[PDB]
Design a protein around this nucleic acid. Structure first.
Lengths: 129, 97, 25, 206, 121, 216, 87, 96, 81
RNA sequence: AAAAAAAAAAA
RNA sequence: AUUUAUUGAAGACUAACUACUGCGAAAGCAUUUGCCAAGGACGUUUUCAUUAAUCAAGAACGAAAGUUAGGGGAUCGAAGAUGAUCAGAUACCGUCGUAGUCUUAACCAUAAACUAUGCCGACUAGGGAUCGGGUGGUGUUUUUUUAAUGACCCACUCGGCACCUUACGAGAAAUCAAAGUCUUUGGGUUCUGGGGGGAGUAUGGUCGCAAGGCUGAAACUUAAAGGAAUUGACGGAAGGG
């Protein structure tokens, strides 16, 4: 059944931006999702977003610009070492310059260039551009 | 390939329909695929109705009618000059004339 | 020819072979 | 913004609600229209004529934004709108098209009815859906008069009105021509009521 | 059959739309002004054209004809068009409105008369 | 004598419009190979393959020839034109015409380290026509155009210097292959990136500007 | 974009559908460019004083062009209560 | 989910499904059943020595008319009867 | 609509909608305080009772169930709490 | 709403 | 004789209402009445608290025909017998008609068993109608003018059978609101396929009273089989002339 809330979220987001919408309603608002969107927003892909604290699980609402072509997910959350990063990126990104791969490490969630700067690796979740 | 989203008939959600028999060739066919029409007709004809009412006691009586529902199958229908055939687009059309 | 009839033919043949092998065994 | 002289006057409102433009469609509806206001019983829906007036003034601003009025077009295959668009063509540049559209009139440059507009206008898009198709083929905006049910796809500026109404159509056309002249400077006084007649803009059966 | 070609019909059409205050419902005189006014290479074709023009002028003498337009017709058209009333029925005869419409007027905050009628289901 | 019947061709013949850059910026409908030859005279044509077709009738098989043609200047501009015709010369003619009319731009870029004078594309771009799906990946310098002869001619005429191709489908239908590559190099400029995130003031139309020396 | 030392490259930096921040292709032959005239001190129109709005074929096909335009106008101030951010 | 599993612990499933579909192939099936070593008159080798038994005027398939001047051989290491083609104009006279 | 506020919508739509598909799911039910004639002994009651409620002082009746809102006895004075 | 079987292959 | 009238017996069937309607996991299910137990959806400010999804192996049900044993055996009717037809006709048509059709107790375990679309879940365009439930409305009608109900109207909503329009998207296309969100390739999961034939054949297993099922190859042979659509030709296919 519903297993990757994260995947359902990113699918809804891709569908919204495909329609050209600028808002979207998300369910059920977990931590990895919060941090994933934090990264996307920091790099400037979406805009603002609100957590709604229904006392059940949480919802999220996200204001979108048009700078997003595909936010994606990688199920299974694959294990990834420090050159595996490079070949992953080469596979699933459009170019060498932009687009970001995302991966949970022991030192929190972040993108691949940042993980290069830190020299740390871990479990790839998704990607975005 | 598929010629009809209904596939011949009016079955979406049953499985089985307990068929009936085409009257012109006694042929089994389901009640959802059968052609059903209904023939309601004056018993005699508009020609001889005058002779009837003239030779009839009980004036202005009724001229009653005979009602029968007719199930034909595809082959007997198309031979009897009914639903004969239509192009693709007007095959999709569903209403009578 | 029709698969229905090829299948019927084949079934009759299997039957016959079964019984003659029964003669042998 | 605007000087506020361009707000709806009660006289224009009298004309509008005499034409019953606010009496739009039935419980039928297209979700591309929040213009409705307090849907009436008898299964009828009522329009924000204020928003109608605003959108009308906007279309007038655009038509005046055109340099060459002939590049604006009037489409009315509808009998209730042919006379209106013809008087529009009279009082403006406004190359009109009544009766038939002759597809390939925006494309197929060789054709004798070949036009190259920077804008088009529509009496009813469902009935005039060919010219908007060619407009989409050839990079041209749209002005349309919708009810609450009209096909608002491939449609830029849309004005809610009772396009089922002869008088509604002719009234809207009258108002638009008037506003265009006012913005062009032909008509001097915004308060001037412009003697010309919606009865002139209307249709006649005989 | 006695059916006529597009050459004949088009010729008669142009001749009528630009020689209306002229040729009348007589085939002979129409024929004479025809071979006076236009160049045709055959007496037979001339006769056919004259006859069809005659039929068309009969239609015109009784009623307008689709596809045709001469000066007098377009003049009468624009005149009957430019007709208007001097009353402007839009101008008040007494006005009626729905309760929803009175509410609309109120929400707009405007001064107008109303003769509200109740519309029932 | 050319003698256009177009606001656009009139403005071009008068000399107001001087760049297909303006044209593509305004997404203008183009209807004159004369316009295109006036703007980009430095282009070359190339006939790719000639396959005949046939229709069956009462009598024999009415055959006519289908020509497919590429046009391009190898600084970022190409076009593609297909035509069926009873004769090969007219086929090639109208193919050239339709290619010139279908001309479109290219968004070249760098595989990395934007040294100078872009060599390759910017992004991974695909294109599909029927069964075929062409993919175009950016390549480093010296990698050369890794592709079939036809796609190689197409990209050479586009001005690309190096690219990788990963393809799929019945690639033996050159029609679909070339149309797919066309669509992909269109999706290049159809694609968005941080160096284009910047907002701009929506320039005005040359038609609205030179409307006086327009049609009449 | 551009090369190592300024020197802009990437000819034809294109336009963007406003309601979406979406690139307009060269061949989006259903795209359009609207120019709304300004008015000043009389109500009369000023020539050459346009507020521009570009739009794409996707939006115009889904028919949301009218509403996107309404909200753009109401944000730029040349319109009023017509639009509502709250549906 | 495109059918196939995707869990991070399903490589067993994936291996065995591969094995079975590989059997659905042709060359894998051949190589692992040893058809060549067990049939195919050679020992899976390329060439083979033989002894002519006789000569033949085998007719051609259609659409064609020809007689292809072949021979019948008894390969040695197996003792197997085979037919073989003699490609050129008149070599049948050299290979009596 | 391609643009709207999904945070401050109208109570119109949000009471139109289902009790779950809103921004925050919440019940559409309510409570009442009811008096029967005679013994006042005012009684608190749910709208969707599922039961036949009665007063503690007298077993007269207060309300009866249904698949939806309950059906209160004819002579009973209720106050939405 | 009697009847009405067959036509070497090749291109 | 046929036919008419009045009766009785037999056994099957459940008409017309009966439809782009319902239920059931599918096969399938239609007179009434009652008994038994079950089930979905809806309502719920009730409870439990992650117990869940799909699943090998392994289990239940499983149209028709068929098989065994008892009853029944009215119709229709494989076989068979016959009258025609035809060059022949043990085939089409006609008349008879055993088995069977029906039922109880057991087996069989298949099907164009089809939506030829595996299940669970999320999101993505419009529109109206319908079935069950629920909500609101001074709405209409029925009673005892009145009430309450009930039935109808309007609005809304959950869950169903479906449906009309477009294609943004998809696809070889036909076509599809899923067959979309897949070269910008990853939500979870079971099953299946790898050119066509030989072949679902042989053998060996196992299940079955049997018929047969389930599993299940090889040799050899071949360059094309095939799918969707186009234009023609043709038709003992229709329409018009």
């Amino acid at each position: 059944t519903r297993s990757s809330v994260l995947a359902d979220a990113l699918n809804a987001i891709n569908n919204a931006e495909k329609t050209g919408k600028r808002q979207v309603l998300i369910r059920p608002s977990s931590k990895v999702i919060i941090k994933f969107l934090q990264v996307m927003q920091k790099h400037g892909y979406i805009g603002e977003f609100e957590y709604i604290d229904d006392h059940r699980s949480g919802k999220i609402v996200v204001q979108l610009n048009g700078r997003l072509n595909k936010c994606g997910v990688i199920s299974p959350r694959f294990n990834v070492k420090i050159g595996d990063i490079e070949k992953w990126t080469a596979n699933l990104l459009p170019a060498r310059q932009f687009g970001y791969v995302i991966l949970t490490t022991s030192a929190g969630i972040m993108d691949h260039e940042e993980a290069r700067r830190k020299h740390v690796s871990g479990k790839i979740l998704g990607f975005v551009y | 390939p598929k010629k009809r989203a209904s596939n011949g008939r009016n079955k979406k959600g049953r499985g089985h329909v307990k068929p009936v028999r085409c009257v012109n060739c006694s042929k089994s066919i389901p009640k959802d695929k059968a052609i059903k029409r209904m023939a309601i007709r004056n018993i005699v004809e508009a020609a001889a109705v005058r002779d009837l009412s003239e030779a009839s006691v009980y004036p202005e009586y009724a001229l009653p009618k005979t009602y029968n529902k007719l199930h034909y199958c595809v082959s007997c229908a198309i031979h009897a000059r009914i639903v004969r055939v239509r192009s693709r687009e007007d095959r999709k059309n569903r209403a009578p004339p | 020819m029709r698969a229905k009839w090829r299948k019927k033919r084949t079934r009759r043949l299997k039957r016959k072979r079964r019984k003659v092998r029964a003669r042998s065994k | 913004s605007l000087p506020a002289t361009f707000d709806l006057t009660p006289e224009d409102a009298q004309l509008l609600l005499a034409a019953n433009t606010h009496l739009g469609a039935r419980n039928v509806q297209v979700h591309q229209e929040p213009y409705v206001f307090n849907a009436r019983p008898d299964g009828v829906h009522v329009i924000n004529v204020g928003k109608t007036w605003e959108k009308l003034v906007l279309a007038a601003r655009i038509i005046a934004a055109i340099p060459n009025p002939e590049d604006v077009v009037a489409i009315s295959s509808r009998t209730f709108g042919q006379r209106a668009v013809l008087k529009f063509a009279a009082h403006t540049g406004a190359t009109p098209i009544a009766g038939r559209f002759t597809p390939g009139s925006f494309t197929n440059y060789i054709t004798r009815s070949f036009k190259e507009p920077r804008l088009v206008i529509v009496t009813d898009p469902r009935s005039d859906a060919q010219a908007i198709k060619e407009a989409s083929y050839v990079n041209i905006p749209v002005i349309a008069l919708t009810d609450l049910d009209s096909p608002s796809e491939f449609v830029d500026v849309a004005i809610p009105c009772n396009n089922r109404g002869k008088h509604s159509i002719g009234l809207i056309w009258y108002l638009l021509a008037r506003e265009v002249l006012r913005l062009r400077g032909a008509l001097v006084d915004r308060t001037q009521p412009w003697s010309i007649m919606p009865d002139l803009y209307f249709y006649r059966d005989p | 059959g006695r059916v006529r070609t597009k050459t004949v019909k088009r010729a008669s059409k142009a001749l009528i739309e630009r020689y209306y205050p002229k040729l009348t419902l007589d085939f002979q005189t129409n024929k004479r002004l025809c071979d006076e006014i236009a160049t045709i290479q055959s007496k037979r074709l001339r006769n056919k054209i004259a006859g069809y023009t005659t039929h068309l002028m009969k239609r015109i003498q009784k009623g307008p004809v689709r596809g045709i337009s001469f000066k007098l017709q377009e003049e009468e058209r624009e005149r009957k068009d430019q007709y208007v009333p001097e009353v402007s029925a839009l101008d008040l005869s007494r006005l009626n409105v729905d309760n929803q419409t009175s509410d609309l007027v109120k929400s707009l905050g405007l001064k107008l008369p109303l003769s509200v009628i109740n519309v029932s289901a | 004598g050319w003698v256009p019947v177009t606001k656009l061709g009139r403005l071009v013949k008068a000399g107001k419009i001087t760049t297909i850059e303006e044209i593509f910026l305004h997404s203008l409908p183009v209807k004159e190979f004369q316009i295109i030859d006036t703007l980009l005279p430095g282009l070359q044509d190339e006939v790719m393959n000639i396959k005949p077709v046939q229709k069956q009738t009462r009598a024999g098989q009415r055959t006519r020839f289908k020509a497919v043609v590429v046009v391009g200047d190898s600084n970022g501009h190409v076009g593609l034109g297909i035509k069926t015709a009873k004769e090969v010369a007219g086929a090639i003619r109208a193919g050239i015409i339709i290619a010139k009319l279908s001309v479109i731009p290219i968004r070249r870029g760098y595989w990395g380290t934007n040294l100078g004078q872009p060599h390759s594309l910017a992004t991974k771009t695909t294109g599909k026509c029927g069964s075929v799906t062409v993919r175009l990946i950016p390549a480093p310098r010296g990698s050369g155009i890794v592709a079939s002869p036809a796609v190689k001619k197409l990209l050479q005429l586009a001005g690309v210097e190096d690219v990788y191709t990963q393809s799929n489908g019945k690639t033996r239908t050159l029609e679909n292959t070339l149309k797919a590559a066309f669509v992909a190099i269109g999706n290049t400029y159809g694609f968005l990136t941080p160096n284009l995130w910047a907002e701009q003031p929506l320039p005005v139309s040359p038609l609205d500007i030179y409307s006086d020396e327009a049609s009449a | 974009m551009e090369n190592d030392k300024g020197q802009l490259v990437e000819l034809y930096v294109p336009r963007k559908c406003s309601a979406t921040n979406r690139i307009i292709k060269a061949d989006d032959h259903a795209s359009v460019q609207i120019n709304v005239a300004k008015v000043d001190e009389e109500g009369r129109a000023i020539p050459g004083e346009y507020v521009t709005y570009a739009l794409s074929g996707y939006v115009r096909s889904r028919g949301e062009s009218d509403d996107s335009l309404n909200r753009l106008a109401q944000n730029d101030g040349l319109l009023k209560n017509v639009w509502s951010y709250s549906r | 989910g495109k059918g196939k599993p995707r869990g991070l612990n399903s490589a067993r499933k994936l291996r065995v499904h591969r094995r079975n579909n590989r059997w659905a192939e042709n060359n894998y099936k051949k190589r692992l059943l040893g058809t060549a070593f067990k049939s195919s008159p050679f020992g899976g080798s390329s060439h083979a020595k033989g002894i002519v038994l006789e000569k033949l005027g085998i007719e051609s398939k259609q659409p064609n008319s020809a007689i292809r001047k072949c021979v019948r051989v008894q390969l040695i290491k197996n003792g197997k009867k085979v037919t073989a083609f003699v490609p050129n104009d008149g070599c049948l006279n050299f290979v009596d | 609509v391609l643009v709207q506020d999904l945070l401050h919508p109208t109570a119109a739509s949000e009471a139109r909608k289902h009790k779950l598909k809103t921004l925050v799911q919440g019940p559409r039910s309510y409570f009442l305080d009811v008096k029967c004639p005679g013994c006042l002994n005012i009684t608190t009651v749910f709208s969707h009772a599922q039961t036949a409620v009665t007063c503690e002082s007298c077993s007269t009746i207060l309300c009866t169930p249904t698949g939806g809102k309950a059906k209160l006895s004819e002579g009973t004075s209720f106050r939405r709490k």
